[PDB]
From a paper:
Each of the 12 ordered density fragments has comparable strength to that of the surrounding portal proteins and well matches a 15-residue-long loop-helix-loop motif. More importantly, each of the scaffold fragments is accommodated into a hydrophobic cavity formed by helices from the crown domains of two neighboring pUL104 molecules (helix 110–124 from one molecule and helices 110–124, 134–164, helix-loop-helix 205–225 from another one). Previous biochemical data indicated that tryptophan residues in the portal of HSV-1 are essential to this portal-scaffold interaction. Consistently, we identified two tryptophan residues (Trp118 and Trp142) in the portal that participate in the interaction with the scaffold, and noted that these residues are conserved among herpesviruses. The present study shows that the portal of the B-capsid makes extensive associations with a protruded region of the middle band of the scaffold, which comprises the scaffold domain and 12 loop-helix-loop scaffold fragments that insert into the pockets of the portal crown domain. A portal structural comparison of the DNA-free and DNA-filled capsids shows that the scaffold fragment binding cavity of the portal is closed off in the virion capsid, suggesting that dissociation of the scaffold fragments from the portal is necessary for the required portal conformational changes during DNA translocation. Meanwhile, disengagement of the bound scaffold fragments from the portal would, in turn, release the restraint on the portal to allow for further conformational changes that are required for DNA packaging to proceed.
Here we present high-resolution structures of the A- and B-capsids and in-situ portals of human cytomegalovirus. The portal proteins are believed to orchestrate nucleation of the procapsid through the formation of a portal–scaffold complex, which facilitates procapsid assembly. During the maturation process, the disassociated scaffold proteins are expelled as the viral DNA is pumped into the capsid through the portal located at a unique vertex of the icosahedral capsid.
Residue numbers in the entry:
A (entry chain V), B (entry chain G): 52 to 320, 488 to 635
C (entry chain A): 250 to 320
Write the structure that this text describes.
Amino acid sequence: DEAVIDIFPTGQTMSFLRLLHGFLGTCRGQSMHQVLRDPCVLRKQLLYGVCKTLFDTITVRRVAEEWKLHAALFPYRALDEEDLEQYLLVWSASLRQSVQTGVLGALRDILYQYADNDDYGLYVDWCVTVGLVPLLDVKTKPSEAAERAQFVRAAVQRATETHPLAQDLLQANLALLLQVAERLGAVRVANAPEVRVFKKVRSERLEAQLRGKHIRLYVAAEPLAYERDKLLFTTPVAHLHEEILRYDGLCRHQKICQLLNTFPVKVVTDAELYHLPVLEAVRKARDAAPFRPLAVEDNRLVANSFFSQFVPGTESLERFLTQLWENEYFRTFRLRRLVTHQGAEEAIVYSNYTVERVTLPYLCHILALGTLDPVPEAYLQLSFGEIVAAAYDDSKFCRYVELICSREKARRRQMSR
Amino acid sequence: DEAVIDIFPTGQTMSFLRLLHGFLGTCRGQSMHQVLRDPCVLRKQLLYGVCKTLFDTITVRRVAEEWKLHAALFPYRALDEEDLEQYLLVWSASLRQSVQTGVLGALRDILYQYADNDDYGLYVDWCVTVGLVPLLDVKTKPSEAAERAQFVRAAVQRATETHPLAQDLLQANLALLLQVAERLGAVRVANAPEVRVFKKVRSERLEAQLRGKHIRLYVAAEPLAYERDKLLFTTPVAHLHEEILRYDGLCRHQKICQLLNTFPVKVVTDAELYHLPVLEAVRKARDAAPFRPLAVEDNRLVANSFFSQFVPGTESLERFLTQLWENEYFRTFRLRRLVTHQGAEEAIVYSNYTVERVTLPYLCHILALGTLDPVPEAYLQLSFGEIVAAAYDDSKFCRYVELICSREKARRRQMSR
Amino acid sequence: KKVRSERLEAQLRGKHIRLYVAAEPLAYERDKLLFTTPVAHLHEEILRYDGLCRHQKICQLLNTFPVKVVT
C-alpha cells in the first residue's frame, strides 16, 4: 500500500461540480460558464474542419472536366453579349448549391447520427475545475467498424443520388471520413460513478482509475505540489472558490436571520394564506407563529438587555461576485461582447483565443487534429448549414470560378471579337 | 428486485414542472420560457422544410414546357419594345402566386388537420429541465395509413382544381409527404400520468417505463452521476432552482410577517369592506381582527421586552432573479432582442443557435430531418403564408425566371433587331 | 378528463358536446393537474395582490382613531 495523495472525490472538488452546475452557489455569473459549453459549437468546428479538408482537394481538374461534360452535353448558345455572363453566374450558383446541399446532407446525417456524445459539456468542466480530464477509451468488436462503414456508405449513397461531384469528393476522402467517425465514437468523458484520480507522491505521474481499472487521462494544467499535502490548483474555478463559499454562507446567514425575526415582539423570562380570506387568515397566522418566550434561571440578578435588528445585505457582494465572475471569464477566455449602438449584451460568444484554448486541445487528445483546423470566430455565429457556403468560399473552389470565368469570356470573346 | 436510482417523479423534478408553469414560482422572467414554446414556429419550420424540398426539384424543365404550352396556346404579340417585359413580369408573378396559393392551400390543409399534437410545448420542458424526453411511439392499425393517403389525395385534389404545376409538384413528392405526415402523427410527448424514468446503477442505460410498459426515450444530456446517489443535472432550470426556492420562501415569509403585524398595538401578559359605509365598516373592522394578548406563567420575574417591525424587501431579489432568469435564457439559447432606436424590448425571438439547439434535434428524433433543413432565423418572424414567397425565392425557381427572361429577350430581340 | 382514457370531453347539462383542445394540460399522479396556459402562469401572483389589497384596507380601517388605550 503506497501513500498516494488524492484529488478528485474530496469535498474540495466534489463541491466544485455541485456549485458549477448550481446545486449550492448561484449568481448571474453562472450563465457565463453555460455559454462555454454549447455542444453545437464543437460539431460546427468539426464540420468546418472536415469540409475545409474536403473541398480544397480537386478544385483544379474537375471544374474543367464536368464543365466540359455539361458543355458537350448542351452547347446551346444564342448570343455572346449579355447571356454568357448570366449562364456563367447561374452555372456557378447551381454547382455551388448542388455540392453544398450534397455534402451538407452527408455531414448532417453522419453527425446527427453519432456526434451527440455531448461530452464537450463535461470536458469544459474538467478543463475548468481541475485542469485535467478523465476519460475511458471505449472499444467494441471490430464488426462495428464495418457497421459504421456500412452507415457512411449509405450516407454516400444518399450523396450518389444527390450529385456526382459531391460523391466524387466523398469517394475521395471517405477513408479519413470514417477515421474521424470512429474517433468521434472512440471515447467518453468518464461520466461514471466511482471514478477517481490521484497523484502518486513517489513519482508524479498522476493517473486515474475507474473502479480498479486504470484509465488514461489528458492533463492540461497539473497543479502545484509542495509539502502542503493538499495542493492548490491553477484552474480558473479554484481562483474563486472561497468567495462563492462566502456568498452561500451569507445566503444561509440571511435566511436564518430572517427566520429568527418573524414575530413582532420579543420577551425574556403552501398557498393557504392567499385564497382564504382575512378573518380566518389572522386566525391561522396567529397559531402559525406561536409566541415563545425564553428563560434561564438566575439568583438575585436579572438582565439589562439590548436588542439588535439587522439583515445582511446581499446586493453588495452579489454585484461584486457577478462582476468578479464576469471579468474573470472574460480574462481567462477572451469571450467577445458584440453589441449594436447603445446595445446591452447582445451576445457573448467564442473568439480566437477561446477556440484555441478549449476546442483545439480537445481535438488534440481526440487526435482528429491531424486533419482539421480552427474555424474563425466570425464564422461561428453563423448557421449549421450556411457555414459551408462561406467555408468553401474561403477555399479556392469559388476562386477558381473567376479564373474559368475569365477563360470562358476569353474563349468566346475571341469568337465574337 | 434491482436497486435503481430514480429521477423523474421525486420532489426535485416534479416540482420543476410546477415552478416552470408557475404553480409555485413567479417572476418577470417566467415569460421567457413561454416565448420558447411557441408551437407555431415548429409548423413554420416544418412547412419551410417541405416547401424547400419541393420547390428545388423541377425548376429547370417544366418552366420551359409550360411556357411553351402557354405560348402555343396564346402567342399574341403587338410590339416587342415595351409590352414584352410587362407581359413577362406579370407572367412571372402569376406563375409564382399560382403555385404559391396551390401549395399554400395544400400545406395549410394537411397542417391544420393533423399537426396540432402541440407536443413541442412539452418537449421544450423536458429539454430544459431534465435534458431528456420520454415519449411513447403511438401506433395504430395499418388502415389509418390508407386514411392518411385518402386525406392527402383529397388535398392534392384541391391542388388539382387549383393549378397543374403545383399538382405536378405534389404528385412528384407525395411519397415523402406521406412519410412526414406519418412521422408527424407517429409519437406523443408522454403527457400521461404514472410515467417514470430511472437510471440503472449496474449499467448506465437509463430508460423510461409507462405504467410498467417499457418506452424508448431520447437523451440529450446525460446527467452527472457519482457516489452521491442523487444526481445533478446540467440543465438550465436546475442551475437556478435553489434561488427561486429562496424567492418563494421569501414570499411566504413576507406574507406571514405582513399577516402578523396587522393589529396596531401588541401587549404582553371578500369585497364587503368597500360597499359598506364607514360607520358599520369600522364596526366590522374591529371584530374582523380581534385584540389578542399573549401569556406564559412565570414566578417573581416578568419581561424586559423588545419590539421588531419589518417585512423583507422583495424587489431586490426580484430584480436579481429576473436579471438571472433573463441572462440565463439569453446565454443558453441566443434569443435575439430586435428593437428600434430607443425602443424597449420590441421582440424576443428565435435566432440561429436556438433552432439548431431545440428544433433540429426534435426533428432528428422524429426522424423527419433526412429531408428537411433549418429555416434561417430572419424568415421565422415572417408570416405563415408569406414565408413561402421568400422561400422558393431563395431557391432557383425565381432565379431561373431571370435566365428565361434573358432567353426570351434574346429570342425576340433577334426578331426585332 | 376521464382518468381511464384521457379523452377529455365536455357535457352541457348531461348532453355531451364536442370541444376543441388547443393545449391539453399536463396530468400526473397529482390528481389536480396543471395547465400550460398563460393566465395560470400568473394566478398566484395576482391572488397575492388581491390579498394585499384586502390587507391594506383592513389595516387602514383599524388605524382610524388617533389614540389607542388598553384596559
